[PDB]
Each structure stands twice: as structure tokens, then as C-alpha cells.
């Protein structure tokens, strides 16, 4: 009962307070009994939802960053009529560094809502994009496989692209949500939008997320919490902590 009661309270406080109206996302912060031994990189680690979808590519604009050549990538993606309406913009890293700096960079930051790049370029990405993107997890660059094909030692790779696979990645991503490991007990994840869905959906999402995080299976991805979990607080971008599952 505490959960949805606090949810109603935080909602009404949002619609009353000016700025609390202006910030628009629900965030939940889990404090764990033990710290995490996983040092913070910026690899966007995502968590699955079993019940309810959240965002749709049809609803969101999107940016893709390729490898350097990008000719066949872009033309194929724009041609195969499964992504031509889907990816708002496509750019190579070198062209990006040639085109945007400073002011225009933060202009991008304001414009786009979700970006992704090839997993062979993600680690290079930060310096061309900027600490300005690299805050929080709202416009944290994602990482999608692009070929559905692998590399072997001493074997040249061959590069391809398939809209079915890539569109599957995007739809999966916007269906579910993500997180980033830390080295202390405090980890934060955005959970749901303030009007796209309802309190029962919120609670279902929360329960599925906590079950995934506590699940013994999928240790490389889901079994990451160490020790008995302490509690879960809820907030928006500027609100105060609200307690759930105190013990």
C-alpha cells in the first residue's frame, strides 16, 4: 500500500509544484546491503520487461552512428523500408567530428532523444560527443550489434547490415529499460513516464525489475546485486526520496 500511496502523493506534489511539473520522469534508486565490484564504465546495461512496453520507435526520434565508411550502411538502412521511417539520422564518427563542435553539439543534445552506435565504435565515442552528453542516463549512447556476425582470431571480419536484426534491437530497447553499474550501494534507474501508463503498470514494472536484478540466473547481466538488498526509493529529477521496501 505504501508504494502506490506514495506514488499518488508524489504525483500530486508534481502537479502542484512548478518545477516538479517541468521534470517529467520517474526514477527509482536501489540501495543495496553490499557495494558492487563493477567499476563504472559507460556500457549501457539494459534490463528486460516481461509485461509492459514503455516507449516506441514510432514515437521517438533516433540517431545512429556507424563505422567510418557508412556508405552501404546508410543507403541500405534508408532503402530497406523497414528503417527508412525509423532512424531519424545516420552519421559517421569522422563526419560528426567534422560537422559538430561546441554550440552545435549541445544543439544536437537538445534535439535528439536516443542515440546508438556500432559496438566497435562505442568506446571511442565519448570524446567526440562530450561530457555534456555523458551525465546521468538520459542521452547515454547505446550499443547495438550491427551484423549479427562475429569475429575470429586471425580472421578478417566481413561487415553487413540487416534491418530485421537492428529493428529488433531498437524495439527491444525502447520496450525495456537499462541501468549502469556503480561501486556503491546506490544505483538509479528511470522507470516509466509520468503519463504514458498507470500505477499498476508502475508496480508490475518495479516487481519485474527487482526480480531480474535479484535473479540468480543471468549473472553476467542480471545477477549483480551483492548481499541483502536494503531498500528502494522513488523520486523525479528534482523531488525528494520516498521509501519502499525498507528492509
Amino acid at each position: 500500500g505504501l508504494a502506490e500511496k506514495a506514488l499518488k502523493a508524489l504525483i500530486l506534489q508534481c502537479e502542484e509544484n512548478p518545477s516538479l511539473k517541468n521534470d517529467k520522469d520517474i526514477h527509482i534508486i536501489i540501495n543495496t546491503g553490499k557495494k558492487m565490484g563493477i567499476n563504472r564504465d559507460n556500457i549501457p546495461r539494459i534490463i528486460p520487461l516481461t509485461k509492459y512496453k514503455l516507449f516506441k520507435p514510432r514515437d521517438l526520434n533516433i540517431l545512429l552512428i556507424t563505422k567510418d565508411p557508412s556508405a552501404l550502411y546508410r543507403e541500405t538502412l534508408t532503402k530497406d523500408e523497414h528503417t527508412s521511417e525509423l532512424f531519424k539520422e545516420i552519421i559517421s564518427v569522422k563526419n560528426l567530428r567534422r560537422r559538430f563542435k561546441g554550440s552545435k553539439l549541445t544543439q544536437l543534445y537538445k534535439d535528439f532523444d536516443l542515440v546508438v552506435a556500432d559496438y566497435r565504435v562505442h568506446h571511442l565515442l565519448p570524446e567526440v560527443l562530450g561530457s555534456r552528453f555523458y551525465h546521468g542516463s538520459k542521452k547515454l549512447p547505446y550499443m547495438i550489434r550491427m551484423s549479427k556476425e562475429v569475429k575470429l582470431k586471425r580472421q578478417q571480419m566481413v561487415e553487413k547490415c540487416d534491418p530485421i536484426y537492428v529493428r529488433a534491437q531498437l524495439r527491444s530497447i525502447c520496450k525495456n529499460t537499462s541501468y549502469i553499474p556503480n561501486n556503491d550501494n546506490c544505483l538509479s534507474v528511470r522507470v516509466g513516464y509520468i503519463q504514458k501508463h498507470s500505477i499498476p503498470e508502475i508496480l508490475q514494472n518495479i516487481q519485474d525489475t527487482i526480480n531480474f536484478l535479484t535473479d540468480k540466473s543471468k549473472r553476467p547481466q542480471g545477477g549483480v546485486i551483492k548481499g541483502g538488498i536494503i531498500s528502494i526509493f522513488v523520486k523525479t529529477s528534482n523531488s525528494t526520496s520516498l521509501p519502499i521496501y525498507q528492509f
Binding site: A6, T240, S241, L242
Partner: peptide, 17 residues
């Protein structure tokens, strides 16, 4: 009516410390 008093308890424990 929850937000104000949960804030209150927050500052209460701070001032108590």
C-alpha cells in the same frame, strides 16, 4: 498528504544527528 511530512522527517533526522 505524504510529501511534506516525509521531507519533515528527513530534516528531523539531519538535525537530530
Amino acid at each position: 498528504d505524504y510529501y511534506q511530512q516525509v521531507q519533515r522527517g528527513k530534516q528531523d533526522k539531519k538535525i537530530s544527528r
